[PDB]
Design a protein around this ligand. Structure first.
Ligand SMILES: Nc1ncnc2c1ncn2[C@@H]1O[C@H](COP(=O)(O)OP(=O)(O)O)[C@@H](O)[C@H]1O
Ligand SMILES: Nc1ncnc2c1ncn2[C@@H]1O[C@H](COP(=O)(O)OP(=O)(O)O)[C@@H](O)[C@H]1O
Ligand SMILES: [Zn+2]
Ligand SMILES: [Zn+2]
Ligand SMILES: [Zn+2]
Ligand SMILES: [Zn+2]
Lengths: 366, 338, 334, 364, 364
């Protein structure tokens, strides 16, 4: 009974990944006691904005003292990591259901903590606060009590008036790199003693876009559906994205210019419920790697070895000029996709074009 | 209506304060001094209350009309100062003024102030009504020959020995902004308590102060070398000048070049400038521009300005400055079809 | 809000079903602007909101008719979009849904009307559906939309679509000759420049619009043969820029159509123009211009506040470069 | 109606949610049961169906299985929605707000009949903040014998503290043909008259939702004859039901202009949905290219066109067929950019006429 | 923080507003005091600092001086912001709107402690119309013993009637090489380690203002934990040295993909905004296109580059320049649709590399 997204939910400032400089920043102030009345955390959704906001409030109210290194056992620490704390008021300005509570709580700030030292106010995406409850925050920020502190979050810092930005100590949480999540996922899986294939992890690392929460959530599904193993054949299938062989044959079908085979692979593929957008993407990247390898034969990645002999063959046999056309055809085809009458169709047509405009041999006529 | 110059006011004011004083013109300093001269003479009388009401479509009409429809019960007299609109009185205003003009008497001094009225706006019921009771003071900025003379006069009363070359330097910078020339003279007096405003001294302080109009960017941008325009453009972000206000300064002069370059064989450059009413020395510079910018260059510069105009209004924060740099570069070098 | 004559044949069968029971509790009317879409909905509800109807119309006395003439009524519900915004809310809908869930105050039929269903929030669509699925006995609905395709397929399935067909042109012109005295040739142009809507056609004249439109064709007639397209600046640069740009577009279309030998032309008003135009401009050149005029008209309507002057000056000068030999005109994107 | 009658009774009756069905089955078959499951996805894609089968697989008298027998009392009762140990909560209901709140504040830790006490919460993101915490608290201290099956169209609106405690399954909308194929199967087994183009029009109309697909199929049965006929289907939706899209394509490709502009006009007179017209044309242009690749591509009700369709296939260059498709696609994007939707369509088709090999040329 | 700790305490501590400091000093030293002073200029250039020193010079117990002693009670209190005769008003504050309005309607004509009652108004252009007139009125009938020191980033937004009654001083943003010299000095007096490149990456960052440079450096310290290193400073401050933006184009037109990819991986390790890099390249190729028609195309900071650009401008055909400008143009548009942004760039260059004029790829 444990899905990685919860079993690895950061407990310490050390456990969080890669955003060194925002952790260091909060480390200093939690040591030196340099607490600002308002902390703004910006960045895409999925990055630990709320997550890092907790570990701050976890060191603000902790019974061990204002610490940058909270103790995971004190009643305050446990209750914070569980969403429920007397003073930690978590408001989702983005909720259609909590509009009144959002408005009321902000019009009635509780100046004296009941248990914890500070009366923390975690608010996700404040640029979406009703104009009514927005002014309440203004009035409380200009002159805030010593006990109350704010922890603002946002997806778009620009929709926030300069009158607010200037009143908070802003922090930009950057997204995570692919092989920074991949490397993380491998490590976590290595520590849980769970099998895996490296090309499966890259797919999971791409799957979530810079969102480690989601990467884990994604890795738990993969485990449940691959019965104990995070295998490409269990993963590739959640995303509906083709195994590098399924995808690789399509690319070959296209280049040999045999149409039946292509539509056949597309039909056989439809059977296992693809994500039509994805079938285009993998083919593009595959074409991309072949282009690189024609420059530096050392280009291929490590798990590519299964398809290494085929990738390498195309590489020396197919003119880069041609490879540029196939990549263009397929991309342009991706631009089209939402306008195509049907997703599956956009993909078929994009391919039938590559076939009709094939450089070495093309569809004929009288 | 004794029509007179700012200098002539103090002498007239001595004979007798009139019913109304209209201060019509564009000079900030001139308007203020005349205004101060009237009031200083009034408050001497017993004119305790002073009032000011600004006329323009939308800024509280029924209040203006009624505020003067009331007399003076125990005869505390107040100055009424009507501030005319920036454009000048429209068809409707001429009436509201007329209604006010009928609110006068010896114990209610009216002072109207705005820029110069057009010969048309001057036939208007309101204007012709005061035409026998009032005095008109023409507050307007000095011609090219007397701008230096005015600076010398103004400086001499500030107890300043302003050299002729220096005087000219001050004139070529801030040309026409009398408020600036006066401040400048006063600042220059703090710098050299001495009093002796020699060319070297004045020159150093003027160049050191480093102030530039959006126009100096354009004036430079007129086929003048990019170096200084790029300099001024990156020195225009240091005075706190919005991008948008720059684009509409470039546009106005750019579209003007478009129409003019278009009219070669339509009418010799000469009469055309008069026709557009901006040729005010800018002529030789405007024509210098016209002579090396091709019909097509001018066009390309219009597309860029347009993208920028949209880029600045579609993402509403896409760092237009970059494009302004790129734009300033097109007005000096021959472009391509890429 | 004026009852036009062509609204009758349709109004006839629409009551003929509300009298014999065949009435559809949800009605979606599609019609061009100024086709009297307005008046048909209102005219139909007055028939159903009568306590003592006289056959085909009301009495004028009864509580319904009176509170009807007084506008304010406990069974008539106007679902106009939220004042200020260009869309409708999920809220307004829910509050009228439950408003009908309780007995009719006058004991009879209850009616609802929408200004334009194609302007509502996606959530607002679904929120409306459930009620049409659970129809409160003897209630009535009236949807209305210029474009019924941009409407949710699952929604337009619950209602009965009724096409409010622009009247035959011969009838629309005669009706028009009465409301304004102008050459029939002009009259037809207005009609065609309104998709057949006689109401909008009529309105084309009432400002000084038409005169404003005549100014445009004169400017165009000068420029076409001369090349100086930048002369249109005075004719186009105005707050009415978009309505004008569209005008300029219809002329462009027509010239394009003539190259393909298309019989029908919108601007019958000035065939001499569309001709010369088509003569001096290749079907490609025309395509090119048609678009820029098209996309530029849109940035004027959409973007909050660009320079009407700059943009257009740019459109204009740009048009002239397409006209120059050797230039590679644009191709649509995505 | 069809929707209720054809509700999945086994995982095998489930259409295209493979990745989810494979994982749930593996877990069920190996006795690996988590305390909470989350099913997300759009409308009518199968969230409740799958949640219901899972509850069924968990309480089947036969044992914990990925294949509920379907005939035991627990299975029948769950099916009827009258099973004492399957507590259904609807967070989206304005009427059951108190019951929603109370049931969640009073979890029944011991099943009364089945081996598990199951809670199924619809649109769980619409719960009050009060209930969220009630739920969180229970998910933090996992009562055994109690399982939570959550469903939602908006996982993100959910507190990450809760989302993190569930096994999340993302259901996908469905491809057209995938729905088309199911509709058919239902109408065959149900002995109801049906045509090919109807099932197409019906599937495409239901955007990826089998739920709606059937609800439309049901209104086609009521509106038309008790027959799912093309005539009825395109009577609800608003399809021309005419060869217009095709003849337009035929004209366009001969560079007939006069007739292309003519057709557009007649078309306009019948109040067509201009975007719908372009979509048909694109679809036609596509099948053609498929026919040019493997001549068996002309489908089911498209037998009506067969001759005409194939004639184009053999007479027009595929290279060109792509060109027309492209030009029209583009047209669809710029369609709302156009001053008027029709002029948008004219802009496009005249465009394909000009950029026509052996077509309109320029002059003085 | 550094900003508050290093606030100017004497005119000599002020960085670069010489023309202003010389005039204020001359006036102060000769007992020539005007009734109102206006300080304009952008952000963090020293307006409030100078206004504060002036108030200090005016009320120093030592006498009216251009060199406040800094140790008398009046000087210390002004410093602390707790001086009874220095009334600070913030027109830009949403919270002090009433106090702003009241204080201006009730000027205190007689100082309680110092020889002058001083009012310092921040962002004076943001005052209500009501207060403007209150102020005007006071500036028209100049209370003695009362001085007004106004500050603003937008003098023009001010009524000309008021602006005309002040002695106006225009503060300039600061020169980058002006800020750097001052940063270099502060750190030294603080014994805080620093690399010469680091201070520049900061001087550039703070746009023309010290106030900002200081807070940026304060942040830099906390992240470099004690030191001010180019790496910690390049951690927040988007960097330029790591940018192959010109060395990528060189590498491009030179044809050594080996280098071209090495550059891209290098760039990647630094976390670049891939589209910006394509902008830098497209904005460079365009300028090299310009140096070929007129040599006067070399800019205000083109200097380091100069030789590198000038070499391209002569050794690369204009046709080929257009070709590369186009290839990168297209690759920019294709970017967001690529399977991965880096991939787009990598492939975009591979395209330039495949369609290169000299030395294009080989094939057997
Ligand atoms: N994946 C599916 N396979 C088979 N039938 C389905 C599927 N999804 C939906 N249906 C049909 O739609 C009806 C409602 O779908 P439902 O499971 O309640 O979806 P959701 O919970 O996503 O709204 C079902 O009773 C069934 O007839
Ligand atoms: N000209 C300057 N000389 C020295 N330090 C300055 C200068 N301008 C700004 N600073 C620094 O910036 C901080 C804030 O600047 P401030 O005087 O309030 O300027 P302004 O009001 O123009 O924003 C000061 O406390 C100081 O450390
Ligand atoms: Zn603790
Ligand atoms: Zn009646
Ligand atoms: Zn069973
Ligand atoms: Zn002192």
């Amino acid at each position: 009974y444990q899905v990685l997204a919860r079993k690895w939910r950061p407990q310490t400032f050390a456990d969080v990944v890669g955003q060194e400089h925002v952790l260091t920043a909060l480390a200093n102030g939690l040591s030196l006691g340099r607490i600002h009345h308002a902390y703004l955390f910006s960045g895409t959704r999925g990055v630990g904005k709320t997550s890092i906001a907790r570990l701050l409030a976890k060191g603000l109210n902790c019974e061990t003292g204002i610490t940058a290194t909270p103790c995971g056992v004190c009643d305050n620490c446990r209750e914070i990591e569980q969403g429920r704390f007397v003073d930690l008021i978590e408001i989702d300005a983005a909720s259609r259901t909590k509009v009144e509570d959002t408005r009321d709580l902000l019009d009635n700030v509780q100046y004296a903590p009941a248990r914890g030292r500070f009366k923390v106010y975690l608010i996700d995406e404040v640029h979406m606060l009703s104009r009514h409850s927005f002014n309440a925050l203004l009035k409380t920020l200009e002159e805030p009590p010593e006990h109350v502190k704010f922890l603002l979050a946002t997806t778009d810092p620009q929709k926030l008036p300069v009158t607010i930005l200037s009143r908070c100590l802003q922090f930009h949480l950057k997204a995570l790199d692919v092989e920074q999540i991949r490397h993380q996922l491998e490590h976590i899986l290595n520590e849980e003693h769970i099998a895996h294939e490296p090309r499966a992890l890259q797919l999971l690392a791409r799957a979530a876009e810079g969102s480690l929460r989601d990467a884990l959530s994604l890795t738990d599904q993969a485990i449940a559906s691959g019965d104990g193993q995070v295998s490409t054949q269990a993963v590739s299938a959640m995303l509906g994205t083709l195994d590098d062989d399924q995808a690789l044959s399509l690319v070959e079908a296209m280049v040999e210019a045999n149409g039946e085979r292509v539509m056949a692979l597309i039909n056989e593929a439809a059977a296992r419920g693809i994500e039509w957008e994805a079938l285009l993407v993998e083919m593009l990247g595959l074409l991309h790697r072949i282009a690189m390898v024609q420059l530096s034969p050392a280009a291929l990645g490590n798990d590519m070895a299964a398809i290494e002999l085929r990738m390498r063959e195309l590489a020396r046999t197919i003119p880069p000029t041609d490879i540029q056309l196939y990549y263009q055809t397929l991309l342009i085809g991706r631009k089209e996709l939402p306008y195509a009458p049907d997703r599956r169709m956009g993909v078929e047509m994009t391919l039938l074009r590559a076939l009709a405009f094939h450089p070495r041999m093309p569809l004929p006529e009288p | 209506m004794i029509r007179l110059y700012p200098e002539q006011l103090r002498a007239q004011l001595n004979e007798g304060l009139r019913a109304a004083y209209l201060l019509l013109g564009n000079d900030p300093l001139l308007l203020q001094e005349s205004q101060d001269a009237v009031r200083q003479v009034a408050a001497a009388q017993g004119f305790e209350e002073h009032h000011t009401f600004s006329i323009d479509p939308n800024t509280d009409w029924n209040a203006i009309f009624s505020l003067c429809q009331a007399m003076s019960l125990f005869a505390s007299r107040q100055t009424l100062l009507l501030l005319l609109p920036e454009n000048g009185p429209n068809a409707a205003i001429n009436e509201q003024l007329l209604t006010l003009t009928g609110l006068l008497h010896d114990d209610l001094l009216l002072i109207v102030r705005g820029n110069k009225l057009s010969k048309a706006q001057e036939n208007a019921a309101w204007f012709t009504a005061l035409a026998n009771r009032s005095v008109q003071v023409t507050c307007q900025t000095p011609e090219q020959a007397q701008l230096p003379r005015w600076v010398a006069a103004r400086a001499k009363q500030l107890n300043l020995e302003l050299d002729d070359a220096a005087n000219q330097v001050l004139c070529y910078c801030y040309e026409g902004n009398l408020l600036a020339l006066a401040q400048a003279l006063e600042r220059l007096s703090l710098l050299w308590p001495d009093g002796k405003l020699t060319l070297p001294r004045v020159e150093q302080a003027v160049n050191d102060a480093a102030h530039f109009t959006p126009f100096h960017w354009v004036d430079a941008l007129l086929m003048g070398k990019s170096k200084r325009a790029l300099h001024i453009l990156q020195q225009l972000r240091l005075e706190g000048s919005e991008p948008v206000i720059l684009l509409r300064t470039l546009q106005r002069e750019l579209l003007l070049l478009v129409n003019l370059k278009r009219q070669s064989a339509h009418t010799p450059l000469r009469a055309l400038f008069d026709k557009h009413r901006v040729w005010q020395n800018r002529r030789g510079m405007m024509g210098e521009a016209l002579n090396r910018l091709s019909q097509t260059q001018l066009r390309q510069a219009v597309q860029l300005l347009t993208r920028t105009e949209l880029t600045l209004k579609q993402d509403y924060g896409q760092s237009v400055w970059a494009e302004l740099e790129g734009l300033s570069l097109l007005l000096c070098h021959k472009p391509l079809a890429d | 809000m004026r009852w036009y004559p062509w609204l009758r044949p349709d109004f006839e069968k629409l009551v003929a079903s509300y009298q014999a029971g065949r009435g559809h509790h949800a009605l979606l009317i599609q019609a061009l602007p100024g086709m009297g879409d307005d008046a048909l909905i209102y005219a139909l509800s007055r028939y159903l909101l009568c306590q003592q109807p006289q056959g085909h119309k009301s009495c004028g006395h009864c509580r319904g008719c009176q509170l009807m003439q007084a506008g304010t009524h406990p069974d008539y519900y106007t679902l106009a979009p939220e004042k200020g915004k260009n869309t409708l809310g999920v809220d307004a809908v829910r509050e009228v849904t439950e408003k009908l869930n309780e007995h009719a105050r006058l004991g009879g039929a209850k009616v609802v009307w929408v200004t334009d269903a194609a302007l509502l929030t996606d959530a607002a669509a679904n929120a409306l559906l459930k009620t049409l699925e659970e129809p409160p006995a003897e209630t009535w609905f009236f949807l209305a939309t210029r474009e019924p395709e941009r409407l949710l397929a699952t929604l337009r399935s619950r209602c009965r679509l009724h096409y409010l067909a622009p009247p035959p042109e011969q009838y629309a012109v005669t009706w028009l000759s009465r409301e304004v005295t102008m050459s029939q040739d002009a009259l037809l142009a207005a009609l065609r420049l309104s998709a057949g809507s006689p109401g909008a056609a009529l309105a084309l004249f009432q400002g000084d619009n038409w005169q404003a439109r005549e100014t445009l064709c004169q400017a165009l007639a000068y420029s076409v043969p001369s090349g100086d397209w930048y002369s249109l600046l005075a004719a186009l640069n105005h707050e009415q820029a978009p309505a004008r740009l569209h005008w300029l577009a219809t002329l462009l279309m027509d010239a394009l159509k003539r190259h393909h030998g298309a019989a029908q032309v919108t601007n019958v008003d000035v065939p001499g123009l569309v001709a010369e135009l088509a003569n001096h401009l290749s079907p490609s050149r025309l395509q090119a211009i048609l678009g820029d005029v098209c996309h530029i008209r849109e940035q004027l309507m959409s973007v909050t506040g660009i320079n009407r002057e700059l943009l257009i000056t740019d459109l204009l000068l740009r048009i002239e470069h397409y006209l120059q030999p050797g230039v590679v005109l644009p191709v649509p994107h995505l």
